Write a protein that binds this ligand. Structure first.
Ligand SMILES: [Zn+2]
Lengths: 34, 104, 228, 43, 200, 150, 146, 350, 171, 65
């Protein structure tokens, strides 16, 4: 789904954020985005 | 036929590596990497009549083949190491890559 | 029609190869009505009627979106509302959803959301992303591919390559008096026992007469009675 | 290499019940080639 | 044809790819690529379980995970959606690195019965990466053995995209005609070592 | 050591894939004969050539007969060899029919035959499976130790 | 046999144009496959019927096919006129490799005389390419008994 | 595996020669599949076609051709050094993008180089092979469904030789074909000078073999040497097979091994188990170019008699035979049976 | 018509070329820049390269979660094995001249997640705290010599203008 | 005999079988086994050794048939 996290090219992940916010942020890499 | 669809590509890169040759005459820390034929049985990069590049690197050995072949979706930089010391200096990034091959 | 036609008949095999069933129509001319039961009998897959599916985020929503092409309903002459799709999402027990979460948005658009041993938010809407566009919305849920063709008269019939038989008699545009079939041992379930005997009588002397040789009629009415 | 047994011979192709009970071997027989002859009668 | 890859097409039990390899020292090993319910796996006669491929190429150092989509599928095709289920099995176990990707295999191997009394439990996957796919061997990089799995895996995805691409194992080029003098030699070295170990 | 004579039963062949068993043994009087009195050796019925489609024996017999009168052996190869139209020229100079289709009297009654004959030398090789070591009979003999069967 | 060849020629060249008759039966690129076998089975029976009215009496493959003794009107036709196209289990000699049958024939050339059909008689002879295509159905005549 | 050896059958001369060239398969338990039972079209000149037994062993036994050499492996190391001279890249450098865009050399199924524009790479390598710097048993099979070319050096695979044709004129050079018959130009020098080369089954993909010199095109390579070399030595004794039906060839090739005639020159000296002879053998009238290469004519099997095809007395209904008492009395094929029997004097413990 | 002569001036100097799998050549028909090397690392006899990199702050950094588990901040190292090959010579192009240098090795730098590793080294250790009580050769021999040897901090600098002079003076 | 390359390409097919026979497969395979491969076996099982009396050894240096 073209979910490439730059500087690692690994993956993205839909993370249940603060107040249930649906921010996308992958594991094994310090990166976040709405 | 389809086997003639690349001798024009062999013309379409001699004119597209000479343009890159001419822009980089200003020696602005540009690099180009290319492979030499080892196992020999110095020269001169020259153009023949109407777009034809070749070298003569040996005393007799003639090499006609020059073709810029890759697609380059990355970065490279050259750096020189010296005797495992305070010797980490970055030279520069490489723009193009060609190959040298003999005729048979 | 040869040796691997005789073998499964005397075996009474549950898995028969190419189970075509025969259904005669009501009309004789097309009149946009000889193929309208073919829409009523075929397993209508929604991936033909859907056009564009994607996941829409504002800030806090996780819902897939589906939009249909109403011109397809005009094209292949099938008859259905919009609400019966929204029924058929929760009518599939393979996808594990809650029964009533479905909201209709306008005419062509339709969307469904889900929400919560963790991180299933990303997983379930990615699992269902391809596991939604593979469900039946209308038609018989057993058969594979119905084929309409023409006989040597102006009357035409419909050939259905499926295993369900009783609901073929239950649907409209067809009579429940002349609908022959294959796979004898499901006629034993549907039409008593005396139909399944005459089904065995009819099949063998059909699949032998088209090889040229003909033994007797009478050598088969003993074979039907010794099995039944 | 697997050893024979009682059940290991009552079943199978022509172990028992097919080459010993159903189809036996007979006495007073022959097995030769054939050649045609028109000049004698049928039967 | 020993020491080559062959593709197969089976109707109802999914489809499998085989590659048999045998060098002259104890080796008789064939490798399988199974496609269970839309997910690719690798089973071998030394591993007790099946392993999805997104681990074993990260165990060879290639871990950037956008290389892996670009090697298997390339670009601008339907292959990326076909491969789209395979990538998340790496995400479930949460390995994401070259270090953890080895011992996942070696925790599920039942082989060699501790012949060496000094195990490392991290070194026993370097040799598990050595007794596999015995066409090529490795020294330190695990480079060519990685992509050789991927080139094997590109065939099996193309098999599911259309079944016409599968070739039969009765094409004459897939047959190695093996003669007598190069066959009596196989019995000779087996029997010649049976001589002198009885002589010692 | 023993030898034997080819009496009836013995399986013959034709080198173009025709199994064949000797039916009977006639004498020489009953055999037919051409104008020169040449008596043929083996008889086969014409009823094989439409079914078996063996064109090769139909053209080998022409290729054989013209070679004998010319005294020269002829080559039959695959995908080539000696042709037909140059071979018919040879034996028509010798005086026979232009495609070997001769005519000959009957040995049993004397007169001509209403149809024409087809004639020549063909190469009949004997096979194995002679009948002197296949005829056997067991009237009442030895029985098996476990089953009391033959 | 050239009449059926150039009728095939206008039927094979409709790949750049993209003609598809769409017979009932969901063709999907077999209209230039399932029809040529129909017209090749026209020339195979027509020429065998020319012989019967144009052969003299007292002819031995004729006089034992006029009876029901042994033979047919098709068996003599393969001996004198044309042997037809070899079929393989309902297939007109499928391709061997690289979308073709032989190294003697050009790439992806979907003509008969190159896939299945052999035009010359048993009396005339067989060419080294067409000798192999007869030697596939002759293998099938021995396998199917097993 | 069992039964890897067999007693050679001394029924005929060629029966002891036909068993020297035969193939015993692996019986991979594909008894339901007619794939291996059938015949594939990638067999023309690779191995024989019209000699295959029937009955139980119906299609798992096959037989070599008349012109056939088996390859042998040489080495895979120096050719990997040779392609780097030809301007191919290395495996540890390329991106993931370029390898699917370009083609790729495969060494025994393994990529090493990721070559671009293969036609300059492959045709120079033929010119390296025909000159004879690299050994000649290498194939440059090059498909186009996937994006790759193949290099093969594994050895032990089928191949046959055919002559090289460059363009609309061949490399025949009939003065060389005259210089062969002088006696100093053998067949090994044809591949040394560059006038013949071996092709496996995989190189016959890329080839466009011609039949005859009257069939040469300016787009036509590799003229075929001799078209009737497609039949085995036990199949070659059929005269004019191209007129004959193909199912009536396997019926003879299964019987040709059962023909009686001579055996050998020392046949009155050897003591074998059950060995027949013919008293008066004769060479056949219509020979073959095949049978004079195996010297079948020097000790033949069977004799040629004078046939008169006709119905007679009803004693030949379907393919029976009728012959005369005189010709047997003149000695028409009086066969002779020789049979061994043996016993061993044995010493006991006392 | 014209000829441009080339000569080889290279000995005693081994230069390695790095490959960045993440960083492409261009960004929207514009060539990007190389990331700034914070620190460097080399291990002889095992030939590794651990280039440390800085990733940017607050905007896309996700600081609060990053320091929690693995406690490693602003450092992203990437591993690459130095692989040699024949041929493959580097060259700078002078006006009407070009001089050559032989390339010793070429590395392919792959992202080496060390902070996830180091957090999971300790996770092996802290699980062992609570209970607390109750011949190889070939390729795996090359791993037991690669983990334990001397590390050398390379002083990352930008130079080579001296090295540009050194090639021209050699004939 | 005005020889041509039209129908006399056959006359090298005996020139193949003369110098290079018809039992090529069994001759050339076994004869390679006798010369080359027999040296390659004893070089793979050279230097028999025992643990008791460690200064004892016996080595296979060559092979002749
Ligand atoms: Zn990432």
């Amino acid at each position: 789904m073209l979910s490439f996290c730059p500087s690692c090219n690994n993956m993205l992940l839909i993370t249940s954020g603060d107040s249930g916010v649906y921010t996308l942020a992958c594991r094994s890499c310090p990166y976040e985005f709405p | 036929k389809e086997a003639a669809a690349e001798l024009e590509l062999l013309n379409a890169d001699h004119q597209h590596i000479l343009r890159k040759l001419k822009k980089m005459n200003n020696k602005p820390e540009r690099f180009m990497v290319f492979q030499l034929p080892t196992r020999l049985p110095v020269g001169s990069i020259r153009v023949h009549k109407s777009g034809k590049l070749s070298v003569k690197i040996g005393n007799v050995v003639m090499d006609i083949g020059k073709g810029a072949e890759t697609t380059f979706l990355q970065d490279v930089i050259a750096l020189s190491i010296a005797d495992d010391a305070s010797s980490a200096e970055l030279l520069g990034r490489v723009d193009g890559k060609i190959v040298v091959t003999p005729q048979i | 029609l040869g040796v691997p036609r005789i073998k499964e008949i005397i075996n009474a095999s549950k898995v028969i190869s190419t189970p075509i069933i025969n259904a005669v129509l009501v009309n004789d001319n097309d009149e946009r009505a000889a193929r309208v039961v073919k829409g009523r009998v075929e397993k209508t897959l929604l991936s033909d009627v859907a056009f564009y599916v994607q996941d829409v985020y504002k800030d806090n929503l996780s819902f897939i979106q589906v939009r249909i092409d109403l011109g397809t309903i005009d094209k292949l002459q099938l008859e259905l509302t919009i609400e019966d799709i929204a029924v058929a999402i929760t009518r599939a027990s393979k996808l594990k959803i809650q029964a009533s979460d479905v909201n209709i948005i306008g005419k062509d658009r339709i969307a469904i959301n889900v929400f919560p041993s963790e991180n299933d938010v990303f997983y379930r809407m990615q699992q269902l992303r391809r596991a939604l566009p593979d469900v039946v919305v209308k038609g018989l849920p057993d058969i594979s591919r119905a084929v309409i063709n023409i006989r040597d008269d102006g009357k035409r019939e419909l050939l259905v390559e499926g295993y369900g038989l009783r609901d073929v008699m239950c649907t409209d545009g067809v009579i429940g008096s002349r609908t022959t079939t294959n796979h004898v041992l499901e006629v034993f379930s549907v039409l008593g026992i005396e139909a399944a005997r005459y089904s065995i009588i009819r099949e063998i002397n059909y699949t032998m007469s088209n090889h040229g040789m003909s033994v007797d009629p009478r050598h088969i009415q003993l074979l039907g009675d010794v099995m039944t | 290499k697997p050893i024979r047994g009682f059940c290991q011979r009552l079943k199978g192709k022509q172990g028992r019940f097919r080459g010993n009970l159903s189809g036996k071997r007979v006495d007073f027989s022959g097995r030769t080639v054939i050649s045609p002859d028109p000049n004698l009668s049928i039967d | 044809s020993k020491n080559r890859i062959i593709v197969e097409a089976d109707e109802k039990k999914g489809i499998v790819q085989a590659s048999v390899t045998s060098s002259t020292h104890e080796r008789k090993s064939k490798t399988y690529v199974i496609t269970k319910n839309g997910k690719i796996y690798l089973k071998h006669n030394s591993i007790a379980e099946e392993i999805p491929i997104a681990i074993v190429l990260k165990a060879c150092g290639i871990l950037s995970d956008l290389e892996i989509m670009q090697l298997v599928c390339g670009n601008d095709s339907s292959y990326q959606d076909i491969f789209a289920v395979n990538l998340e099995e790496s995400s479930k176990l949460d390995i994401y690195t070259q270090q953890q990707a080895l011992e996942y295999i070696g925790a599920k191997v039942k082989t060699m019965r501790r012949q060496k009394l000094t195990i490392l439990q991290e070194g026993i996957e370097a040799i598990a990466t050595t007794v596999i796919a015995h066409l090529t061997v490795e020294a330190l990089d695990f480079r060519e053995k990685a992509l050789y799995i991927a080139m094997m895996t590109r065939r099996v995805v193309m098999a599911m995209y259309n079944p016409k691409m599968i070739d039969d194992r009765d094409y004459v080029g897939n047959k190695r005609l093996e003669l007598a003098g190069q066959l009596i030699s196989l019995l000779f070295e087996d029997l010649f070592k049976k001589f002198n170990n009885d002589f010692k | 050591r023993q030898n034997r004579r080819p009496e009836l039963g013995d399986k013959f062949s034709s080198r173009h894939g025709q199994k064949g068993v000797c039916g009977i043994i006639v004498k020489q009087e009953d055999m037919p004969f051409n104008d020169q009195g040449i008596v043929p050796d083996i008889i086969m019925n014409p009823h094989g050539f439409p079914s078996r489609m063996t064109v090769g024996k139909m053209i080998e017999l022409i290729s054989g007969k013209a070679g004998v009168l010319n005294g020269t052996l002829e080559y039959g190869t695959c995908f080539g060899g000696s042709k037909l139209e140059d071979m018919s020229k040879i034996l028509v100079d010798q005086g026979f029919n232009y495609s070997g289709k001769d005519m000959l009297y009957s040995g049993i009654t004397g007169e001509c035959l209403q149809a024409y004959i087809f004639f020549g030398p063909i190469y009949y090789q004997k096979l194995k499976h002679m009948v002197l070591d296949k005829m056997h009979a067991r009237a009442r003999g030895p029985r098996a130790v476990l089953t009391r069967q033959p | 046999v050239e009449i059926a060849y150039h009728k095939c020629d206008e039927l094979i060249t409709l790949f750049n144009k993209g003609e598809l008759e769409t017979q009932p039966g969901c063709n999907e690129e077999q209209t230039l496959e399932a029809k040529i076998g129909g017209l090749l089975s026209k020339v195979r029976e027509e020429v065998g019927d020319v012989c019967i009215n144009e052969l003299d009496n007292w002819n031995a493959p004729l006089i034992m096919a006029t009876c029901g003794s042994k033979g047919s009107t098709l068996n003599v036709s393969q001996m004198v006129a044309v042997v037809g196209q070899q079929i393989i289990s309902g297939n007109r000699v499928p391709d061997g490799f690289q979308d073709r049958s032989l190294p003697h024939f050009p790439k992806n050339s979907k003509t008969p005389q190159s896939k299945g059909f052999v035009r010359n008689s048993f009396f005339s002879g067989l060419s080294p390419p067409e000798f192999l295509f007869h030697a596939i159905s002759g293998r099938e005549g021995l396998v199917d008994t097993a | 595996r069992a039964g890897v050896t067999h007693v050679l059958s001394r029924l005929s001369y060629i029966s002891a020669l036909g068993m020297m060239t035969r193939i015993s398969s692996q019986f991979e338990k594909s008894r339901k599949v007619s794939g291996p039972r059938a015949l594939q079209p990638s067999q023309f000149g690779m191995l024989c076609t019209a000699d295959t037994p029937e009955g139980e062993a119906c299609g798992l036994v096959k037989n070599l051709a008349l012109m056939t050499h088996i390859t042998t492996d040489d080495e895979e190391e120096p050719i990997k050094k040779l392609c780097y001279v030809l301007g191919v890249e290395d495996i540890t450098l390329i991106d993931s993008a370029s390898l699917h865009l370009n083609y790729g050399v495969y060494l025994n199924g393994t990529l090493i180089g990721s070559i671009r524009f293969p036609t300059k790479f492959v045709t120079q390598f033929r010119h390296l092979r025909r000159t004879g710097k690299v050994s000649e048993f290498i194939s440059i099979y090059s498909n186009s469904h996937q994006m790759a070319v193949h290099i093969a050096t594994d050895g032990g695979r089928i191949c046959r030789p055919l002559i090289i044709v460059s363009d609309g004129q061949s490399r025949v050079k009939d003065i060389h074909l005259r210089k062969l018959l002088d006696g100093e130009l053998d067949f090994d020098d044809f591949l040394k000078l560059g006038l013949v080369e071996y092709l496996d089954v995989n190189e016959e993909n890329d080839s466009y073999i011609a039949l005859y010199e009257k069939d040469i095109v300016p787009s036509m390579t590799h003229l075929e040497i001799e078209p009737f070399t497609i039949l085995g030595a036990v199949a070659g004794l059929i005269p004019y097979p191209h007129h004959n039906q193909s199912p009536r060839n396997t019926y003879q090739c299964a019987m040709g091994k059962q023909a009686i005639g001579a055996i050998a020159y020392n046949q009155f000296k050897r003591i074998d188990t059950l060995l027949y002879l013919m008293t008066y053998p004769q060479q056949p009238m219509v020979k073959t170019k095949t049978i004079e290469l195996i010297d079948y004519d020097k000790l033949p099997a069977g004799q040629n008699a004078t046939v008169a095809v006709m119905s007679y007395s009803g004693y030949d209904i379907e393919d029976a035979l009728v012959l005369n008492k005189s010709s047997i009395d003149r000695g028409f094929g009086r066969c002779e049976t020789r049979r061994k029997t043996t016993t061993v004097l044995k010493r006991y413990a006392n | 018509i014209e000829e441009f002569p080339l000569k080889i001036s290279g000995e005693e100097e081994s230069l390695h070329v790095f490959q960045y799998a993440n960083r492409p050549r261009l960004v929207g028909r514009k060539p990007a820049e190389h990331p700034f090397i914070s620190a460097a690392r080399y291990k002889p006899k095992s030939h590794l390269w651990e280039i440390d990199i800085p990733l940017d702050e607050q905007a896309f950094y996700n600081k609060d979660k990053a320091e929690s588990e693995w406690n490693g901040v602003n450092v992203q190292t990437l591993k690459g094995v130095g692989v040699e090959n024949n041929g493959q010579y580097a060259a700078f192009v002078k006006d009407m001249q070009v001089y050559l240098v032989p390339i010793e090795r070429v590395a392919q730098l792959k992202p080496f997640f060390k902070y996830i590793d180091d957090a999971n080294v300790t996770r092996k250790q802290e699980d062992a705290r609570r209970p607390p009580n109750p011949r190889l050769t070939g390729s795996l021999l090359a791993h037991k010599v690669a983990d334990e040897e001397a590390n050398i901090e390379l002083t990352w600098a930008e130079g080579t203008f001296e090295q540009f002079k050194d090639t021209i003076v050699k004939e | 005999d005005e020889i041509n390359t039209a129908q006399d390409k056959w006359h090298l097919l005996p020139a193949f079988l003369k110098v290079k026979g018809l039992v090529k497969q069994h001759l050339d395979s076994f004869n390679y086994f006798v010369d080359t491969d027999l040296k390659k076996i004893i070089k793979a099982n050279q230097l028999i050794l025992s643990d008791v009396d460690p200064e004892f050894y016996l080595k296979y240096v060559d092979i002749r048939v």
